[model samples]
Target chain A: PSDYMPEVADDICSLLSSGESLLKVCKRPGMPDKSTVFRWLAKHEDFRDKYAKATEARADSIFEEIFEIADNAIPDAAEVAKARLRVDTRKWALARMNPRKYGDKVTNELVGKDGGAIQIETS
Target chain B: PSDYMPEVADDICSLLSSGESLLKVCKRPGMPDKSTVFRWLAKHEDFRDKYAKATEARADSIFEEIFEIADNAIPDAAEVAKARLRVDTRKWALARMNPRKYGDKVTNELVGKDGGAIQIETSPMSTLFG
Candidate 1:
């Protein structure tokens, strides 16, 4: 039976707030296993609320990181690709994790098979 | 066996783009059931892409609705409350469905047990290593 230690929970939340994912955070020594942390999330309201705040903090940090990446000096073609990859990965994570602030908007254009514009009518 | 009919899928996508939910669309006569539509989504890549686009369109339409709701003339207290609720609901949807264009930026402030501010060292270089 895994106990819900407040200090451990706070540490997990702190690490997450500092931009460490739960998967990686749990890997450190003395940290609770992934399932135990998930169990705490599902079972403890306090932990759930703390975890939510941590994720919000993580998203905010990542948001700033995107700006820094964009402003970096391009060293060469290989570094350019690396920077692009890093930015894209973070964008994808932010878009899904805290989508409200970092999600992408797509054009709502869908053509019919015959290439005609699809008509939309309100019932 | 559920059929992956292109015509039906397109019609579903059309309705979705027009701000309809899959649940409501499937309730109409001749449309497939919710499970059937889900099956098509898993079994057909075309349908999956179309549904994804439809969701984006729905989010855009809902975003526009929030504008309309906000701009409406408030007749009274009840009307104001109703408008606020409608706008809030649409905002919640847009924030999740299409966050990049309509998501809220939150302040990152967390206090420790002793009331100290939690520091976040989100250096750009650290992000690259991670």
Candidate 2:
């Protein structure tokens, strides 16, 4: 497995190194078919989990950094501040809440549906 | 709306069956004051169409495969590849194309527009077309 693994890995690495797309890489001059590659990823639990976690972590860091910057740079102008904050928070929530909108909202939409209105007392 | 859109899309598919982001998930402890997940993705137009074409067809495939090997042999290398491909192509193209120089040569006694001196060749129609 390791033998085939390294060869395949090297090919993948080479493609990635060239800055080509996955489709491009899979279709590289000399490499396995796309499905073969997918199967490899599918069968390999460690690989799948590591990539998923890493992607999430990177996205999380990006959102955190952006949020921090926005939090610190809150504009003095009320409307501008609100708009900027809204966008920043939207990105933050998008990244932190559900990075994938799934072509639709899939997070933070259910609050006061139990039978009582949730009060929002602004100070 | 389809019974809480199937009970909050089944509680947002039960907080995505594993992970959460929407200020609330990472807030697994407690969500924050972001927008209400933006009107729930402007509506999930389809109970289907969840899998759009080419959505993850290209980059996802290669990256996942690279990770597959890295996951088995050298995990770090895969991480390297994952980080590497995020570069912007246009910026890359610009960096590759050198642009600085301009126009024609002025030669001789002081300077002369070389265009007239060097007669440009215009082949007669009889050479080929005629």
Candidate 3:
């Protein structure tokens, strides 16, 4: 139940930094007890260190990449790929560090392309 | 409005570590310019250091104190007070470090439950939880 890693931690931090509650952020639709997030935050130093560094990097890179892509390039598939890469890299970094970080629990609740909840595992 | 402290930054990190977007995280439901979160992250070093330290400490302390409370007996109001003290100390440590960290804007949007939010005024002399 210990889901901690730099990239995962960064995602969590990104959510928190934006202003969502730990419970809401961690709640993957039907998942039980959102306290898991608190538990992770309370422990996991590796996750913390990685999260801190990654997030520090992410905070800058995410915005910069998005801005550059959005401002200069045409909104084509390639441009979308470029933008998606930024998000994907951020997500991949988080997932690679911990598979559980993007477990079925969280993925299950994610809004699918159809706007319904669907689970997708990165690992 | 600029809200950055070790504790506040820690909270943001806490939320981020759990998983959320900078836009969703920063949006106060009614506030404008959620991109401000990115702006802050892009430019602010003080906020980053404070956030990193506070989150590292928070990740350790929150679970420990919760476990201590849950595993123990009595569960009396006094015991609750003791547990709350830990949370309060953490919150205080965070806010006392940043004047602009706990703005009324965030408070306005917070749930009314006492558990929802508590903003503190920090002075210049204070250090992180010791």
Candidate 4:
């Protein structure tokens, strides 16, 4: 909070919004390290918003790239698998980007309401 | 059941029960392939029971091997990690062999009463949730 310079915030936001991973931009030479970024995210709502917009930008960017490849790329086994490799990395990253806006979730209730034991059965 | 022989089942069971994997034993010299064993498991109850006991034996055998290694092996970080590898393999194998008695199975309830679609919502950050 004390050491973080907003002078660099705009530059950091651009790098993030341009689809550069937080790790990459944060870890780059002569820049703020991971903990500083983590701290900023925790303390500063503005920094966290920047990070979120960056993630959204990345998700949007890769999605277009995926459609681009799909619409134009040749239909072959090797091409399909190669496409799969790209799709998997981006798809996995995007899923965590916003699971709230994404997949189904399952909950396991281990304990009963009374706090006695896990009253459950599997058939 | 048609192609299977009881004599060979003993041999297969012995290998599996002796801590060898299903793949290794099935693929070995002059033995049945994976499909045949799977077929037998489907067809014959007695044979399937034998497979279960063999899996149980494997679990027991690995447990002993883990303890023996723990006692006899030199206590070093590298050595301990190396030793843990074998224990982990057996632990995983045993769990899958009979997940019913081993790992508690989670029942995933999807379609409800009247086969209605279930809509859900949760915090995405926590991967596992209701």
Candidate number with greatest TM-score: 1
**Interface RMSD for each of the candidates:** 29.4, 33.2, 26.3, 20.2
Judged by whole-model lDDT over C-alpha atoms, candidate 2 comes out at 0.37
Q: List, for all models, the DockQ compared with the true complex.
A: 0.01, 0.02, 0.02, 0.01
lDDT of 2 by residue, A1-123 (tens): 222364665556445433233445666555766555555666777555543454444444434555554566435444333334333333422232233521134222222324233323232
In model 2, the runs with Cα more than 4 Å from the true position are A1-4, A10-20, A53-123, B1-130
Which 10-residue span in candidate 2 chain B carries the lowest summed lDDT? B98-107
Model 2 chain A TM-score equals 0.35
lDDT of 4 by residue, A4-104 (tens): 76766666777766655555566566677644555566678887777677767766665566676566645755455444444443443444455454333
Judging by lDDT, tell me the better candidate of 1 and 4. Answer: 1
Badly placed stretches (over 4 Å) of model 4 are A1-3, A27-30, A69-82, A104-123, B1-130
Question: Which 10 residues in a row give candidate 3 chain B its minimum summed lDDT?
Answer: B103-112
Tell me the spans in candidate 3 whose CA falls farther than 4 Å from its real position.
Answer: A29-33, A49-123, B1-32, B44-130
Task: Specify the poorest-scoring 10-residue window by lDDT in model 1 chain B.
Answer: B118-127
True interface contacts reproduced, per candidate: 0.00, 0.01, 0.00, 0.01
